[PDB]
Amino acid sequence: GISRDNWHKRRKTGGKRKPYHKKRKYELGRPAANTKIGPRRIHTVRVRGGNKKYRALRLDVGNFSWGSECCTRKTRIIDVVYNASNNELVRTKTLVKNCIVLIDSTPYRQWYESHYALPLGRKKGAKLTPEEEEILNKKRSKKIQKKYDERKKNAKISSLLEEQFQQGKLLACIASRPGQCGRADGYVLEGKELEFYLRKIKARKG
Amino acid sequence: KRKSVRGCIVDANLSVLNLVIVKKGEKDIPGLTDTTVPRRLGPKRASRIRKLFNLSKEDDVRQYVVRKPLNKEGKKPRTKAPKIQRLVTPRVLQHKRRRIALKKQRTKKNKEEAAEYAKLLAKRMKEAKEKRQEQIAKRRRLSSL
């Protein structure tokens, strides 16, 4: 079978070594899962102990975390943009750990509105008054007013994050093992890590 | 295991076929339309009994069970009763009240034993606090002599 043994290689001295026994069963591999993007499809695997792994093969939704203010939400994964390990997986759109992606931004927008009550994403005159004016109400003034005013010197969002919201979609990273788990979990890029990967992408365009 | 078979399609090269007629027009072949075997045995669980006689879970089931007569056995035409499964009885109900009243216990226990929590440990916490007085003393000897 597809083995993982370390008796088929050479010694430290580059000397061969012979097979004093044959293939066992506890030393295996299996074919990779190579998750892509699309409607959900999972296959399940039986393994040592009588336990389970779950080969995910197609995923679209994931749980992602804006960590500065600690809010996790569920979003739809749009596209893949960069991968340090190899450069073909982006062409074929494979999700593995520490791939960089693009996702929707509406949930984090909505929470921010409901929390700090401010227009995240500058739109000239297209967005000012369908409902954010309906968001802006102070029905019990002088009791929540001091509260929301205290939730004022605590937003100060970065310039670069704003540009993403103003586009519509933002960067994230993946931190789970889907062919082992069946899930796509991860976090949002911020700070110098964000700077780093922007430089790589833009240079790739050249 | 590996085995040989023939396909589904029909041709000449066979020996025997199996055919099931579905309805009769008019003629009544003597070999297949005059005689008839009765269904050898009857149902055995209550739900199919009530499905047959339309009894509707108001009246009992025991009185309406089929009996097998002992023709040709030798001497006596005895008559026998199958046994019924999926039935409500004093035993199954006794089993149920045991488990459930014992399974309101296991959380009334662990609650009788949360009384033991509050009692055993949450007094021993209340007992070591009147102790620690050697300690707050012995670091008073550090503080303010």
Partner: protein, 262 residues
Amino acid sequence: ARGPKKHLKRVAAPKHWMLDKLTGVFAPRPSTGPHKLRECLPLIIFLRNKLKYALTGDEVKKICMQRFIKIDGKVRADITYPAGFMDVISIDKTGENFRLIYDTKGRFAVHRITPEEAKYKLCKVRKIFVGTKGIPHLVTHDARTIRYPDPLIKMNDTIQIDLETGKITDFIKFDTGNLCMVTGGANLGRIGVITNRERHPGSFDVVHVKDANGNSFATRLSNIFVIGKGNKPWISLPRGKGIRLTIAEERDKRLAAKQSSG
């Protein structure tokens, strides 16, 4: 090789079961249990060979499935059950109530106790930990798990169990000046006072025990076991009191007592 074992040979066996070479090929293979395989005593051996009630093994089966014998309260009808140490073996039909304590030479002698005093036992602690909800837990050496200790109980310490519902009572610590008994190695079945604990970070720790008669020896800490508050054991003890009187002394004793002790 390709699975776990089920048999045991006879010249593969522990030395203190005292099996006859020229009697058979196999030995009883203690079944799986809370006590190890090397340091145990299955029920057949305690009963066919020592007590000599029965003279075969089939006889032992005919007596166990009558539900007379019972280990430490809870009856046991698995003939191959692995007895332990400081345990209790209560028939109570004819009021036997054994205790299963070592000799001085390491052989698990018989020790008869009273009807009273056969309703508790002592246990060494192996580890402690807190499970969920901050609920503490405590594991002995005989695979017996107990919630809610007193918070003044730490590892390698001894407790007295009332044997009906767990319910620890009467605990004691590990310190100098209290008795000790040995459970492994070479000084097996000896008693003494601890007097020191030399410890090394990253290896085994050590005690320097001293007996009252003058002997001073040392062991690894894991083989230790504590039974006293200082010169005061809480249990009935066997003949010999953990001494290891040398071979020349026995020679005087027996010869001089031979044809004079009778």
